Structure 1
Amino acid sequence: VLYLIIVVGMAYLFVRLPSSFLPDEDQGVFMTMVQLPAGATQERTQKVL
């Protein structure tokens, strides 16, 4: 009967454990993006870059 509760705690654990699909790995190369208010010019974004 004690072994019985060994089962139910599993369900308690299933709530605690979240769900994802695929981890993020260290590829060594990453990206960065710059977005400016509309109506701007090429010089402004070039200076920001």
Structure 2
Amino acid sequence: SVGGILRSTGRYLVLYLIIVVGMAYLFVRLPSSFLPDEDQGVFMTMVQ
């Protein structure tokens, strides 16, 4: 199967660029934070 891919080549060069553009899309699409909120077994309630 690897031996067959070497004969083609051209097709898998295009498939690679689709993954790189797909990666570039997912990167920008995914929101950004710093550190997630952890369950610490404790919390507080404010009363004003």
The verdict on a shared fold, with TM-score over 0.5 as the criterion, is yes
Higher relative contact order, structure no. (Cα contacts within 8 Å, ≥ 6 residues apart): 1
The sequence identity of aligned pairs, in percent, is 100
Root-mean-square deviation over aligned CA pairs: 1.0
Relative to the length of structure 2, the TM-score reads: 0.61
Relative to the length of structure 1, the TM-score reads: 0.60
* Structure 2 runs not aligned, ≥5 long: 1-13
| Greater C-alpha Rg | 1
What is the aligned partner in structure 2 of residue 41 from structure 1? none
Q: Pick the aligned partner of 2:25 from 12, 22, 27.
A: 12
Offset at 1:2?
A: 2.0
- Say how many residue pairs are matched: 35
Q: Which has the higher helix share?
A: 2
